Amino acid sequence: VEKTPWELVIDFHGHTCPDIALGYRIAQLAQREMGIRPAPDSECLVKAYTQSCALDAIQVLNKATIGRHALIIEETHRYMYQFHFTGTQDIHQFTVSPAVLDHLETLRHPDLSPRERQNKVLEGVQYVLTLEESAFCHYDKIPGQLSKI
Amino acid sequence: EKTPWELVIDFHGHTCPDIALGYRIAQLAQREMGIRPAPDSECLVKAYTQSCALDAIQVLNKATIGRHALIIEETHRYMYQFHFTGTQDIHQFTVSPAVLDHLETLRHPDLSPRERQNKVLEGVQYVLTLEESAFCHYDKIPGQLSKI
Ligand SMILES: [Zn+2]
Ligand SMILES: [Zn+2]
C-alpha cells in the first residue's frame, strides 16, 4: 500500500489548496507527454514563470528540484511551465488557461470568515480537478532546450 | 514508512556530499528549534546559497519553495536562518569554512568517472562523521523572517 502521487505531493506541500492541485495536474500531464527518459543521465529540467504552490507538485512528481538547480524560476506572474529532458531537442510547454486563474481569484476575499474561506479552498480544488484538459491548459511541444546556470 | 534519510535521498535523486550537509543542518535545526508553537506557525528558512543541501531542508523542515517558505538570497554562503512564525527567534547555522574547503579539495576538473565517484563517497562519509562542533556554528538570535 504505497502512497499515491497525490498523497506524496500533499505530504511534501503541507496543505491542500487549489494552486497545488493545479501543479499536480501540470506535473502529471508533463509526465504523460514528455515520453520515456532517453538516457540514465538525462535530467528533467523545468522553467516556471511564476512562484506558487504548484511548484511543489513539480518538485515531487517530475523530480525537478530547487536543490539540483533543475527547477528554474523566472518570476513574470505567468502560470507557464517549460519542461525539458536534457540531451533532447524539445520543450514541453504548458500554459494554464487564463479563465482558470480568473475563477480561482474569485474564491479569495480578504474579509471571509475562516469557515467560509476554507469552504472556498475546497471548492477551488474541486474546480481544478474537474476541468477537462483543454479547459485546464494549452500544451505546445516546441524546439528548445533548458540548461542549468 | 521511509526514514528521514530515505525521504531526502529519494526526493533529491542522488547521494552527494552537499545533500549530506543539508541533511545534517536540517536535523540540527529540527532539534534546536523546539516544538512548533501553534498549528498556524510555519517554518521559514532563509538560505544564503542554492545547492543540493536545500532539498534536505525542504523535505525535513517542511520549508518549501512552493510555499514561499524557503527563501534564497544567493551570496555563495553556506548559512541558513530558521524561524517559526509567531516567535522571536532566528536559529542560524553556518557550515564551517574548513569543511567546505576540504570538500572542495575532493573535486578536480579532470577526474575519471571512477575516481570522481570514489571522491563523492569519500566526501559523503566525511560530512557524516564530523562532530557537531566541527561541522557548523549555531547562533540563536532575536529576529524574525516573513514571506516576501
Ligand atoms: Zn498551497
Ligand atoms: Zn546533490
Author numbering:
A (entry chain A): 3 to 151
B (entry chain B): 4 to 151
From the paper:
Here, the first crystal structures from PF02663 are described, representing two bacterial and one archaeal species: B8FYU2_DESHY from the anaerobic dehalogenating bacterium Desulfito­bacterium hafniense DCB-2, Q2LQ23_SYNAS from the syntrophic bacterium Syntrophus aciditrophicus SB and Q9HJ63_THEAC from the thermoacidophilic archaeon Thermoplasma acidophilum. Two of these proteins, Q9HJ63_THEAC and Q2LQ23_SYNAS, contain two domains: an N-terminal thioredoxin-like α+β core domain (NTD) consisting of a five-stranded, mixed β-sheet flanked by several α-helices and a C-terminal zinc-finger domain (CTD). The proximity of fmdE to genes encoding the catalytic subunits suggests a role in methanogenesis for proteins in PF02663. Individual proteins within this family display differences in domain architectures, metal-ion binding propensities and dimer interactions.
B8FYU2_DESHY, on the other hand, is composed solely of the NTD. The final model includes two protein molecules (residues 3–151 for chain A; residues 4–151 for chain B), 18 ethylene glycol molecules, one Zn atom, one Ni atom and 427 water molecules in the asymmetric unit. The total β-­sheet and α-helical contents are 24% and 58%, respectively. The monomer consists of a central five-stranded, mixed β-sheet (21345 topology) with one solvent-exposed face, while the other is covered by three α-­helices. A distinctive feature of the structure is the protrusion of two helices (α4 and α5) and a connecting loop (residues 99–138) from the core of each molecule. X-ray anomalous scattering measurements indicated that the site had a mixed occupancy of zinc and nickel. The total occupancy of the zinc and nickel cations was reduced to 0.75 to match the observed scattering at this site, with a zinc:nickel ion stoichiometric ratio of 2.6:1 estimated from the ratio of their anomalous difference map peak heights. Pairwise structural comparisons of B8FYU2_DESHY, Q9HJ63_THEAC and Q2LQ23_SYNAS revealed that the NTDs of B8FYU2_DESHY and Q9HJ63_THEAC are the most similar. The second motif contains Asp58, Gln61 and Thr67 (B8FYU2_DESHY num­bering) and is located along the twofold-symmetry axis at the dimer interface. The absence of a zinc-finger domain in some PF02663 homologs, such as B8FYU2_DESHY, provides some evidence for involvement in alternate processes.
